[PDB]
């Protein structure tokens with residue numbers, strides 16, 4: 183059946199290039215193969231015949247010019263899109279209200295840098311707002327003791343209007359593995375809510391404190407190991423607390439999670455999953471090294487509701503322990519139209535049953551998509567941390583978990599990538615541990631892409647490019663070397679050596695993905711959209727069931743790139759029209 187997706191505007195963007203005014207727009211999933219377009223500069227039509235593809239270069243437009251696009255459905259023109267002005271720079275600059283540094287109880291001062299982002303349409307105007315986590319200098323991996331400054335989540339319209347700031351406060355430790363924020367229209371009112379784990383002292387967008395404004399559950403290591411734990415759905419448009427229930431999976435004893443000093447307990451992941459196969463559910467997960475819990479929520483009709491819990495420590499679920507990554511994927515792997523949860527080396531079914539465990543355990547990178555088009559169903563490429571794992575890299579049937587192939591590594595293979603980078607081999611290539619492989623497992627020559635981080639559809643072809651740091655690279659499959667396509671100067675990635683963008687997403691223009699990177703001084707976010715023309719028209723990736731969810735989970739823990747439900751790549755079958763509705 184049809185999934186709830188977002189009512190998007192035309193996402194019409196206009197960028198000044200050397201070649202003229204590059205203009206792209208969304209091919210909406212509401213629209214048919216027969217939909218064509220007309221581009222208007224300042225009110226006059228630029229194309230003789232309606233164009234098929236959703237990008238256009240206006241060789242005569244200037245910076246002052248404004249663009250609209252008109253669809254042509256079934257013979258007749260449609261009402262104009264929103265007016266788009268031309269970006270003077272190849273990025274749009276979103277000025278941030280940069281929070282002042284602070285002092286921890288220990289006298290240590292910290293500063294803020296803009297960190298992981300997510301997007302939602304929070305005021306329902308058809309355009310994505312940027313939901314931005316601020317990270318304090320002293321933020322901590324679960325293994326490191328020390329106090330951390332307050333986590334701050336801002337929401338920004340692309341014009342730079344700071345809608346609100348949520349201050350998570352003293353009782354939410356700052357760090358990659360702590361706050362996993364879900365930004366999504368959970369209840370289908372066309373506006374996104376922001377849901378995340380909150381604590382006493384959490385100050386919402388209106389300046390209201392959740393729970394006990396004065397409670398301080400920070401232990402002397404600056405961890406928060408006692409005290410209540412909340413889940414708050416916030417109103418997107420105001421940052422107003424909508425509902426706050428107690429967080430699940432509950433902490434219990436720190437030790438249940440496989441250590442006593444407070445590491446494994448605070449290993450959060452979060453997702454959006456269409457578990458009913460139609461409307462989004464919220465997934466909050468705790469732990470992955472040993473004890474592992476996934477609980478599913480619906481936020482609907484102003485009510486937060488627990489859908490199910492999977493608990494590794496509950497009898498029968500033994501296999502589903504120690505399998506989680508610092509990331510997850512959400513997809514319909516059994517073709518039943520409901521989403522399952524690729525949870526590293528294990529998969530949780532749409533009803534919360536553990537489907538399989540490869541038993542290969544924890545890893546730092548996970549890739550779920552149609553990695554092998556010549557095989558029906560989805561494949562999961564996964565790398566594994568444990569040096570004695572049967573494989574360091576596994577390539578498995580996403581549905582059954584049966585390993586189609588793996589390669590024994592012998593060490594911590596800490597990065598893995600799937601992407602169609604080589605058209606000489608049908609499907610997405612995978613690379614980890616100094617070797618690039620075909621979907622079938624055949625080692626492709628020698629050499630790998632210079633990054634094993636993100637893949638991004640950035641240029642005009644169906645091959646995916648690589649993203650790492652402030653760079654987008656392209657794989658020269660014939661020569662076996664990576665080539666740089668973009669270095670975003672003055673922009674920087676986040677999360678140290680994970681070097682993730684603030685966000686990567688198709689959030690404006692055509693099917694290629696935008697990168698959002700904070701400036702070095704986090705005074706602004708830079709939205710880069712591609713100006714490389716493509717002859718391919720694809721539905722906005724944000725209307726792809728697997729991709730859109732992928733964006734929801736991008737921020738979580740160790741940011742993975744988003745994948746599409748269908749094989750998008752060289753020799754792909756014409757893509758399915760998405761089975762969707764908007765509110």
Ligand SMILES: O=C(O)[C@H]1O[C@H](O[C@@H]2[C@H](O)[C@@H](O)[C@@H](O)O[C@@H]2C(=O)O)[C@H](O)[C@@H](O)[C@H]1O
Nearest residue numbers: 323325508546594596597677678679680681
């Ligand atoms: O990919 C990387 O840059 C690293 O990921 C893991 O390191 C994580 C942090 O980035 C690191 O600074 C430290 O706090 O530990 C983290 C973790 O253990 O997950 C790997 O441990 C590194 O080898 C490297 O791959």
Ligand SMILES: [Ca+2]
Nearest residue numbers: 303304305309
């Ligand atoms: Ca909006």
Ligand SMILES: [Ca+2]
Nearest residue numbers: 367373374375
């Ligand atoms: Ca909503």
Ligand SMILES: [Ca+2]
Nearest residue numbers: 514515516520
């Ligand atoms: Ca399914």
Ligand SMILES: [Ca+2]
Nearest residue numbers: 516518531532
């Ligand atoms: Ca299922």
Ligand SMILES: [Ca+2]
Nearest residue numbers: 508545546567
């Ligand atoms: Ca790891």
Ligand SMILES: [Ca+2]
Nearest residue numbers: 554555557559
């Ligand atoms: Ca396949």
Ligand SMILES: [Ca+2]
Nearest residue numbers: 604605607609
């Ligand atoms: Ca390929």
Ligand SMILES: [Ca+2]
Nearest residue numbers: 641643645646
């Ligand atoms: Ca490409």
Ligand SMILES: [Ca+2]
Nearest residue numbers: 690691692694
């Ligand atoms: Ca785009």
Ligand SMILES: [Ca+2]
Nearest residue numbers: 737738739741
């Ligand atoms: Ca993250």
